[PDB]
Amino acid sequence: HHMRTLNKDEHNYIKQIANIHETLLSQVESNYKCTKLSIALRYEMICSRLEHTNDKIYIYENEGQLIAFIWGHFSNEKSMVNIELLYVEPQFRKLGIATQLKIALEKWAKTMNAKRISNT
């Protein structure tokens, strides 16, 4: 249905995620600013992550639009999953989508034999 695995060839969605990720980092104002270059590099970096086996992005989509997503990365050194990014479009908050996304990512973490997902 609406929640599904994001594939590495979904370039538009990956660009959108890259842009949101860089924006959110920039917004905390800790000697880090998003730029066109940082967004382009983030796009390549996410594509690279999705080519290997240590990362998972679950999206929530409707009518060809990205409503929400969660991105997890498994660290072989730490044997656990870190949540790289969890985002829900403001308009669609408090509908249970972040909770659903976390549950899905935790199930994925178990298939990797990961101790847990990120705290927050």
Q: Where are the domains of the chain?
A: 1-120
Count other C-beta atoms under 10 Å from residue 74's C-beta. 21
Rounded CA gap, 57 and 42, in Å?
14
Rounded CA gap, 77 and 97, in Å?
30
**Composition of the chain by helix, strand, coil, percent to 5:** 40, 25, 30
Angle (CA) 114-101-1 rounded to 5° is 120
4 bridge partner residues: 59
**H or E element in which residue 46 lies:** helix 36-51
97 bridge partner residues: none
Rounded CA gap, 104 and 97, in Å?
11
Superfamily of domain 1-120: Gcn5-related N-acetyltransferase (GNAT) (3.40.630.30)
- Cβ partners under 8 Å of residue 12, min gap 6: none
Deposited resolution, Å: 1.6
Question: 56 in helix, strand or coil?
Answer: strand
